[PDB]
């Protein structure tokens, strides 16, 4: 609506202003009263395909794995390599910009 609620709570609201504002209140709470069921169903589905995912060995000794990179695509840097590799094990002998290091 192009007519905004010019008043605030300290000054009080208008009857029409309150009737306009109640739509945002109902819509905000309706999804919470409804979309949590979707979240529960999604979590239930997720735990099913996550049944037998237990660690069995320490190091299977597999070969090279996945690439890693920052998220500079689109806009600025959001998740740098400083945060996306904390808790990872390398695949190949990664060397510094100084070669053979």
């Amino acid at each position: 609506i192009e007519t905004p609620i010019t008043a605030n709570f300290r000054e009080g609201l208008n009857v029409l202003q309150y009737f306009i504002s109640t739509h945002g209140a109902r819509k905000g709470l309706a999804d919470t009263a409804l979309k949590t069921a979707n979240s529960g169903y999604l979590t239930r589905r997720l735990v099913d395909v996550a049944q037998d995912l237990v660690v069995t060995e320490d190091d299977c000794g597999t070969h090279e794995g996945i690439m890693m990179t920052p998220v500079i695509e689109g806009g600025d840097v959001k998740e740098p390599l400083r945060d996306r590799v904390l808790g990872r094990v390398t695949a190949e002998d990664v060397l510094k910009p100084g070669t053979a290091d």
Partner: protein
């Protein structure tokens, strides 16, 4: 009654170590069968184990391998609709064509079948009913299909039918090692649930109530015996078809009420819950009785804020004696204050000053689990060393409310005491609140002041 739905001969005694009349009782005779009635004497637990059977006159088709997708149509390579037409005693099937005019597994109408009768008669084999399907399963051979379909499949690699031939090949192969003759598809004898699991229990007000499974069993038996009576009476085939349809519909509803036809209801016009419904859906046993269970030695109360340390929880002193009641009984005899357990319970009921003296050592060094519904992530349950509070509510450490997503606005918490030595050990070693500082999702701390 004898040879009824709760016949003690078939299923067992109604009371522990007691026969129907009283010829043998009091463990004087261990496991004899009373000749006057025919009831074996044993515990009543046998009534949960023993099962009976229903002997049908006309073989009937199972509904799971018929309506669900087909498992009886794919095996026979027959249209589903034609299977229903044959089932309802409407369309004949050629089991064997002695002449070249007919062909195996042919749909036939009654008028078109009269021509076959006036032409050939005994030379061909074509009849009506589910037993015709049973005979078709008996006559067919799957090894010939294995050696035939696979060879011709390689000839024409049509992708639209490639998966169909692949499915047939997989089905016949699976039948190869299963040792499972498909002749068991058509049910001739039907097992009955143990009576203790379809219970008819008297109520306090002289009333009764029983599971709807009992009604379905009565319904199938009522028409099964009628079908038996329609054979010696030489019933016209038009009415025998109707009786066989009645039996097929009844057994179908017994297996699944609202699957093949209209959902058969009771006197409350609500559909009767078949035993397939007992295991299906959220109301099924797999979810409501196997994964989610009611638990013992547990309680619930409102939550309130605590000064407490991070490993401490505020227990109401009144719930602790109820939860740890067996622990109080066990440590009370060790203290020697009660010669017998009866005196232990009596003095617990009196709530003497002694029980609190014992309680202050039973609780300590014994963590107790806390729970907040719903448990979203792992930190929804945490161990806490109890602290007895002379109050009514549970006091919680403020710093763990954010992890619990709990606000002191009337939220309720679920308390759970671990019993075995390992559980009391697992809670302290791994489930303790002091251990959980970082979230499993990310190494960010979770004990942040809010």
């Amino acid at each position: 009654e004898r040879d009824g739905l709760f016949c003690a001969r078939i299923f067992g005694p109604v009371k522990d170590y007691e026969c129907l009349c009283g010829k043998y009782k009091r463990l004087k005779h261990r496991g004899v069968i009373c000749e006057k009635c025919g009831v074996e004497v044993t515990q009543t637990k046998v009534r949960r184990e023993r099962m009976g059977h229903i002997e049908l006159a006309s073989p009937t088709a199972h509904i799971w391998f018929l309506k669900s997708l087909s498992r009886i149509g794919l095996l026979l390579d027959m249209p589903l609709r034609d299977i229903e037409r044959v089932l309802y005693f409407e369309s004949y099937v050629v089991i064997e064509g002695g002449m070249t005019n007919l062909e195996r597994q042919q749909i036939l109408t009654e008028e078109q079948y009269l021509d076959a009768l006036e032409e050939f008669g005994d030379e061909f084999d074509a009849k009506m009913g589910a037993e015709a399907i049973q005979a078709l399963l008996k006559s067919m051979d799957l090894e010939q299909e294995c050696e035939q379909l696979r060879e011709e499949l390689n000839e024409t690699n049509s992708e639209t039918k490639r998966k169909k031939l692949t499915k047939r090949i997989k089905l016949l192969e699976a039948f190869v090692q299963s040792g499972n003759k498909p002749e068991w598809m058509i049910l001739t004898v039907l097992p009955v649930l143990p009576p203790d699991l379809r219970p008819l229990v008297p109520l306090d007000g002289g009333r009764f109530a029983t599971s709807d499974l009992n009604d379905l069993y009565r319904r199938v038996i009522n028409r099964n015996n009628r079908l038996k009576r329609l054979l010696d009476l030489a019933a016209p085939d038009i009415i025998v078809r109707n009786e066989k349809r009645m039996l097929q519909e009844a057994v179908d509803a017994l297996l699944d009420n609202g699957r093949r036809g209209r959902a058969i209801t009771g006197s409350n016009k609500r559909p009767l819950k078949s035993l397939a419904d007992m295991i299906k859906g959220k109301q099924g046993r797999f979810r409501q009785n196997l994964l989610g269970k009611r638990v013992d030695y547990s309680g619930r109360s409102v939550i309130t804020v605590g000064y407490l340390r991070l490993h401490q929880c505020g227990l109401p002193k009144k719930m602790a004696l109820e939860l740890f009641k067996p622990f109080i009984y066990g440590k009370l005899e060790l203290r020697g204050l009660a010669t017998t357990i009866k005196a232990a319970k009596k003095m617990v009921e009196r709530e003497e000053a002694v029980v609190w003296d014992i309680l202050d050592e039973v609780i300590r060094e014994h963590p107790v689990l806390l729970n907040r519904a719903p448990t979203l992530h792992r930190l929804g349950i945490q161990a806490f060393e109890p602290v007895l509070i002379e109050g009514k509510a549970i006091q919680l450490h403020p710093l763990v409310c954010a992890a619990y997503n709990a606000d002191f606005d009337g939220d309720q918490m679920a308390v759970h005491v671990p019993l075995t030595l390992e559980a009391q050990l697992e809670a302290r070693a791994l489930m303790m609140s002091t251990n959980n500082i970082l979230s499993p999702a990310n190494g960010e701390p979770i004990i942040v002041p809010s």
